[PDB]
């Protein structure tokens, strides 16, 4: 039960913005300029680590 719960929580954590326009990398890349894309990607990386 615990080994399933931990993995389920880890998988579900991927759908959190942590503060950004969107929680999907492709939309951010195809929507904004590189100078703001760097900030968004840094925010997501700091969220997931």
Partner 1 sequence: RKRISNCVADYSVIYNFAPFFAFKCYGVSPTKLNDLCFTNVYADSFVG
Backbone torsion region of residue 19, taken as left when φ is above 0, otherwise alpha when ψ lies between -120 and 50, otherwise beta: left
Q: How far is the CB of 2 from partner 1 (least distance, A)?
A: 41
17 counts as binding partner 1 under rule CB under 8 A: no
User: Judged by CB under 8 A, which of 7, 13, 14, 31 binds partner 1?
Assistant: 31
User: How far apart, in whole angstroms, are the C-alpha atoms of residue 22 and residue 7?
Assistant: 23
C-alpha 29/C-alpha 6 separation (Å) is 30
The yes or no reply on residue 33 touching partner 1 (CB under 8 A) is: yes
Which residues sit at the interface with partner 1, rule CB under 8 A?
21, 30-33, 36
């Amino acid at each position: 039960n615990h080994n399933a719960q931990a993995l389920n929580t880890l998988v579900k954590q991927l759908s959190s913005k942590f503060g950004a326009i969107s929680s999907v990398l492709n939309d951010i890349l195809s929507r904004l300029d590189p100078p703001e894309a760097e900030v968004q990607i840094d925010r997501l990386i700091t969220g997931r680590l």
